[PDB]
């Protein structure tokens, strides 16, 4: 495998109102994508910048 | 118009914690992509299958 | 070498819809059919046998 399993988790905005720009790795598209995150909870496939997403999820 | 305006809304897991793998239209990528929906609330850009998303949002 | 989730048991979860799916069974060294109920469960959960085999079989 080329990346940790959490990179394969679908985007989760968490339960807070969606307000913040964040990034997640989309394994189907093989790319890190912007989404709107609530700021609280969610899952490990959640990065502050595209660069950090790309470093972790390759 | 190619699709309803609601197709451009962000993915929204909502405030509940019943994790349903679901699909949303990503207008940037022009693709129906997977996200976690929490089972309540959220918005109209929320489909039970990729096929339903692709028919409704193109 | 393959994802950790390949080693998790099949899990239909508690929801009451029907998504025929495949999971990897390490004892059998093959992917096997199960019904996913639509929510919860785990990542050892594929729409096609071929994807399950690609990801989880040696």
Rounded to whole angstroms, what are the CA distances from B39 to A27, B15, C57?
A: 23, 8, 33
Q: How far apart (Å, rounded) are the C-alpha atoms in residues C24 and C56?
A: 6
Domain hosting C52: range is: 1-58
Rounded to whole angstroms, what are the CA distances from A27 to A41, B53, C53?
A: 21, 18, 17
* CB contact at 8 A, C10 and C23: yes
Helices (H), chain B: 50-57
* CB contact at 8 A, B14 and C32: no
- Dihedral of the alpha carbons of C55, A57, A40, B32, in degrees to the nearest 10: -60
Q: Are strands C19-25 and C30-36 parallel, antiparallel or unpaired?
A: antiparallel
Q: How far is CA A44 from the centre of its chain?
A: 7
| Backbone φ and ψ of A54, nearest 5° | -70, -35
CATH of the domain at A18: 4.10.410.10
Which experimental technique did the depositors report for determining this structure? Answer: X-ray
B45 touches chain A (CB under 8 A): no
* CB contact at 8 A, C2 and C19: no
| Backbone φ and ψ of C12, nearest 5° | -65, -30
C43 touches chain B (CB under 8 A): no
Beta strand spans in C1-58 (E): 19-25, 30-36
Q: How far apart (Å, rounded) are the C-alpha atoms in residues C11 and B36?
A: 17
Note the maximum CA span of chain C.
34
Distance to chain C for A11, nearest Cα, Å: 14
In b/e form, how buried is each residue of B9-35, taking b as 16+ CB within 10 angstroms? bbbbbbbeebbbbbbbbbeeeebbbbb
Choose, out of B8, B10, B39, B48, the residue to mutate when testing the contact with A (most A CBs < 10 Å).
Answer: B10
Residue (of C41, A47, A10) closest to B13 by Cα position: A10
C4 with A5: Cβ contact below 8 A: yes
Resolution of the model in angstroms: 1.6
A chain contacts of residue B14, beta-carbon cutoff 8 Å: 15
Name residues whose C-beta falls within 8 Å of residue B9's C-beta, 6 or more positions apart in sequence: B24, B43, B44, B45
Instruction: Provide the number of structural domains found in chain C.
Output: 1
Q: How far apart (Å, rounded) are the C-alpha atoms in residues C28 and C39?
A: 26
* CB contact at 8 A, B24 and B32: yes
Kindly state the tokens that stand for A12: 């989760």
Kindly state the tokens that stand for C54: 């690609």
* CB contact at 8 A, C6 and C53: no
Q: How far is CA B29 from the centre of its chain?
A: 13
Distance to chain B for A1, nearest Cα, Å: 21
A8 with C3: Cβ contact below 8 A: yes
- CA angle B13–A49–A32, rounded 5-degree value: 65
Q: How far apart (Å, rounded) are the C-alpha atoms in residues A50 and A58?
A: 11
- At B21 the three-state DSSP class reads strand
Q: How far is CA C37 from the centre of its chain?
A: 12
């Amino acid at each position: 495998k080329d990346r940790p399993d959490f990179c394969e988790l679908p985007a989760d905005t968490g339960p807070c109102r969606v307000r913040f720009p964040s990034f997640y790795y989309n394994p189907d598209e093989k790319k890190c994508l912007e989404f709107i995150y609530g700021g609280c909870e969610g899952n490990a496939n959640n990065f502050i910048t595209k660069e950090e997403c790309e470093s972790t999820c390759a």
